[PDB]
């Protein structure tokens, strides 16, 4: 369902990383498979060549945490007006306090040791169920 259209009409885009994370851009190909692209360090920008009707999302490259692009989940290049590129501003969402705590705990504890933590079973599951692009695609669908 979620897949790029094969339009063939060029569209130039600036990916602008306004987050403190290393960013992984992900292009959804014509069969809906996620294809990873080169990463962007915190605060950097890249001018790239994409196409009208193509679909992109953006993740923390190390943890796969979800990020926003122009305040939403998905970015679709549009028609360039007067030769100007489209800006894709990548930012942190406001995470729930729970998800933010899970991020920090996942960054300190090796996955084998999640079970050694003194917490209710359901939080062991929450830690182990770490962010992943496929799961989000199956949701969005």
């Amino acid at each position: 369902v979620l897949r790029s259209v094969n339009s063939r009409e060029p569209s130039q885009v600036i990916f602008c990383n306004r987050s403190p994370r290393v960013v992984l851009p992900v292009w959804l190909n014509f069969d809906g498979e996620p294809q990873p692209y080169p990463t962007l360090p915190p605060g950097t920008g890249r001018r790239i060549h994409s196409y009208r009707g193509h679909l992109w999302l953006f993740r923390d490259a190390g943890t796969h945490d979800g990020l926003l692009v122009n305040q939403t989940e998905l970015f679709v290049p549009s028609l360039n007006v007067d030769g100007q590129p489209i800006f894709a501003n990548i930012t942190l969402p406001v995470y729930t306090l729970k998800e933010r705590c899970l991020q920090v705990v996942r960054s300190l504890v090796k996955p084998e040791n999640y079970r050694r933590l003194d917490i209710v079973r359901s939080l062991y599951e929450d830690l182990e169920d770490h962010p992943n692009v496929q799961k989000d695609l199956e949701r969005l669908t």
């Binding site: 406001v94 306090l97 300190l108 917490i119 939080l123």
Partner: protein, 87 residues
């Protein structure tokens, strides 16, 4: 302006805007103007209050969003509070 009082297990009294506290569905239920938390100490509940302020300020803003900071030493207890408070 309407405030409410949130009391930690060690007796610290945190006074925050009612609107901010309603970030938590659990607190909403405990109110529906003071709530005592027998399992949440002040080094955790102070951070919870700072999260309310951060969320209200930055929800629906184009102004670049900073990372919410959490010291390693408090991360596990904070996780437990967030899960109880559903926030």
């Amino acid at each position: 302006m309407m405030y409410v009082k949130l009391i930690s297990s060690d007796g610290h009294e945190f006074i925050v805007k009612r609107e901010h506290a309603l970030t938590s569905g659990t607190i909403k239920a405990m109110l529906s103007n003071e709530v005592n938390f027998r399992e949440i100490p002040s080094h955790v509940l102070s951070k919870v209050c700072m999260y309310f302020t951060y969320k209200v300020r930055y929800t629906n803003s184009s102004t670049e969003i900073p990372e919410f900071p959490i010291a390693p030493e408090i991360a596990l207890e904070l996780l437990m509070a967030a899960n109880f408070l559903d926030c």
